[PDB]
């Protein structure tokens, strides 16, 4: 979790918000995915959210469903994802790395062993999409024992009990959901609810990153203006991969321009 703490202290010193891209590991292939991630970082990503391909990603819309499918077509497994994570960390010692997991992949052959593998490879956080705080005990306990931040979700209609639980249980950052529904660039989320941002701060929650439907620099600026510590964009980034499958070079150039623009918006 320390890599997030250091990042947010640095960004606070610079009076800056974070921009955090999501991609699926191994989409469209291992070697291209590694180059994609190097391009995201070089373009100014403050941290990464990285998906391990899962057969049935129920919090994800078609764009990221299709990313998962491409990774599987390339034969990507969780073991190969961990091989990729080692390589990424070896090149980039300080960038925070969060994984986006589905429960079955964590539970599969032992929750403890999963978080141990995360620590061994130098992952900083794990967000298990289909484990609400109510079912989280063994996941968050295993995370903290292995110095991994467990990430929890503050939905738009979060009540006070939930705000207090999320503030107490989570580390690294708090996920501030922009809207109901599944991941998707087309479905734009609302402005960060200021009262949630303010309540999380009151309860000493990990800093908030807004996500779901954040696809333009204007939304990034609005998120930081509203008091969030930054923003996550996934589908918008993945659409650039999908659009440019036949043009690996154009893919990277377009990823670079987009990420640069998104990051610049976080300085506002």
């Amino acid at each position: 979790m320390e890599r997030y703490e250091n990042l947010f202290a640095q960004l606070n010193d610079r009076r800056e918000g974070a921009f955090v891209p999501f991609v699926t590991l191994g989409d469209p292939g291992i070697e291209q995915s590694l180059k994609i991630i190097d391009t995201l970082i070089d373009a100014g990503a403050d941290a990464l959210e990285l998906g391990v391909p899962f057969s049935d990603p129920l919090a994800d819309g078609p764009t990221i469903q299709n990313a998962n499918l491409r990774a599987f077509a390339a034969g990507v497994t969780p073991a190969q994802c961990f091989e990729m994570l080692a390589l990424i960390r070896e090149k980039h010692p300080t960038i925070p790395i969060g994984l986006l997991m589905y429960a079955n992949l964590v539970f599969n052959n032992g929750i403890d062993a999963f978080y141990a593998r995360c620590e061994q490879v130098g992952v900083d956080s794990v967000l298990v999409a289909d484990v609400p705080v109510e079912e989280s005990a063994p996941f968050r306990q295993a995370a903290l024992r292995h110095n991994i931040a467990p990430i929890f979700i503050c939905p738009p209609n979060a009540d006070d009990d939930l705000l207090r639980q999320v503030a107490s249980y989570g580390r690294g950052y708090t996920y501030l959901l922009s809207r109901s529904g599944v991941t998707g660039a087309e479905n734009r989320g609302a402005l960060p609810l200021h009262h949630l941002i303010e309540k999380l701060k009151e309860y000493h929650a990990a800093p908030a990153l807004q996500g779901f439907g954040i696809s333009s620099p204007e939304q990034v600026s609005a998120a930081v203006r509203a008091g969030a510590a930054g923003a996550i964009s996934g589908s918008a980034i993945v659409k650039i991969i999908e659009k440019n499958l036949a043009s690996p070079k154009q893919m990277l150039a377009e990823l670079r321009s987009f990420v640069s623009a998104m990051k610049a918006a976080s300085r506002a």
């Binding site: 599969n108 609400p132 939905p155």
Partner: protein, 395 residues
């Protein structure tokens, strides 16, 4: 926090994205409230009797057990309005949707019987219904697609994954996670996140209650065993529930063996899978070594699902119920046998249950046993599928 226990031993829970937790808690609260509301119960009972046609008959087979010491009764859910047991709990959930001020219904369907039930209840009670159905199932259960659409439901083909029931479930849940403020998710089986396995059991438990009263009237004793197919668990838990505390009554659930367990092309996670987390629940799953969810297979769309409801996982774990499998070929033989010897055309799902009871009798023909098979549905939806198979053969 919940009002009711979300677990059956290790199995069950509420493994959904955080966004959906309030909807699940609201539904649990509405259910607890409705269960103690005499007006709700009177409305539900009235619909079951005067609209759906309950109680359903308990029929003694006259021919198929000749020359053996097996007495076999069929609990006639095939006679329910809509043509399967699915109609029972849809009527209760539709009333809950209205109680919660929802005007929209989302449902998954495989065999199309839950889809038809969802559509008919929505037509009756003034709800806007949309149904997800795997594209493979749209073809192999086509008569039900026509029935749903005639009743004004939107039927949405799902092409993703196996294009069968699990993929329909996935799309229904994804839809609900964005539409829950106005839509009720009318989950069609005793599986998924709490409170669904509990609500579905309680809204199907008249099956076993009636069966008990009927067999006592006709035989003066309880069955030696009740036998039901298990796609997600609703018809089986509906039959089982009232007999759980009758320790002498065997509870036998039948999973689809597909082309044979050894082929990997089956739908029998309770006996051949391992515990995992998917579709909102911790339950036995067909999964790869790495924990990806596998695609299931059965000739029967209603059984073709790679998991199972948590209460069955639990009843199995403690040995209270036994679970077995029946292959496509065994189910087809049972289908033909019932058509030709009892004049009843069963759903292929239900034919798996029948096939097991026929095996119990044939294997041990001098064993005295009084058996009830839950005949969960009629086979009209399957006649074209079965015809085509028997023709590609020579029968």
């Amino acid at each position: 926090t919940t009002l009711l226990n979300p677990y059956f031993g290790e199995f069950g829970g509420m493994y959904v994205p955080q966004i959906l937790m309030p909807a699940l808690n609201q539904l649990e609260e509405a259910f607890v409230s409705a269960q103690k509301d005499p007006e709700f119960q009177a409305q539900f009972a009235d619909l079951l009797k005067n609209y759906a046609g309950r109680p359903t008959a308990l029929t003694k087979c006259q021919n198929i057990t000749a020359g053996t010491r097996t007495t076999l009764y069929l609990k006639r859910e095939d006679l329910l309005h809509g043509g399967a047991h699915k109609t029972n709990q849809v009527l209760g959930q539709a009333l809950l949707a209205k109680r919660m001020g929802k005007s929209e219904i989302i449902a998954e369907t495989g065999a199309g019987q839950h889809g038809v039930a969802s559509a008919l209840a929505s037509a009756l009670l003034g709800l806007k219904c949309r149904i997800y159905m795997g594209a493979k199932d749209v073809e192999r259960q086509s008569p039900n697609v026509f029935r749903m659409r005639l009743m004004g439901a939107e039927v949405i083909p799902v092409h993703s994954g196996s294009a069968t029931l699990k993929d329909a479930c996935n799309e229904a849940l994804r839809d609900w996670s964005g539409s829950y403020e106005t839509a009720h998710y009318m989950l069609g089986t005793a599986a998924g996140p709490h409170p669904y396995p509990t609500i579905v059991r309680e809204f199907q438990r008249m099956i076993g209650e009636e069966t008990k009263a009927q067999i006592l009237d006709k035989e003066g004793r309880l069955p030696d065993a009740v036998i039901a197919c298990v796609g997600g668990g609703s018809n089986a838990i509906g039959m089982f529930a009232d007999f759980i505390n009758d320790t002498s009554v065997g509870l036998i659930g039948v999973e689809p063996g597909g082309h044979g367990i050894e082929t990997g092309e089956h739908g029998a996670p309770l006996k051949h899978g391992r515990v995992g987390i998917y579709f909102g629940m911790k339950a036995p799953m067909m999964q790869t070594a790495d924990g990806q969810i596998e695609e299931s297979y059965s000739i029967s769309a209603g059984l073709d699902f790679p998991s199972v409801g948590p209460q069955h996982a639990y009843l199995n774990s403690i040995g209270r119920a036994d679970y077995v499998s029946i292959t496509d070929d065994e189910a087809l033989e049972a289908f033909k046998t019932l058509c030709r010897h009892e004049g009843i055309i069963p759903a292929l799902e239900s034919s798996h249950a029948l096939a097991h009871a026929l095996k119990m009798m044939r294997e041990q023909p001098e064993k005295e046993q009084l058996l009830v098979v839950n005949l969960s549905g009629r086979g009209d939806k399957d006649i074209f599928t079965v015809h085509d198979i028997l023709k590609a053969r020579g029968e």
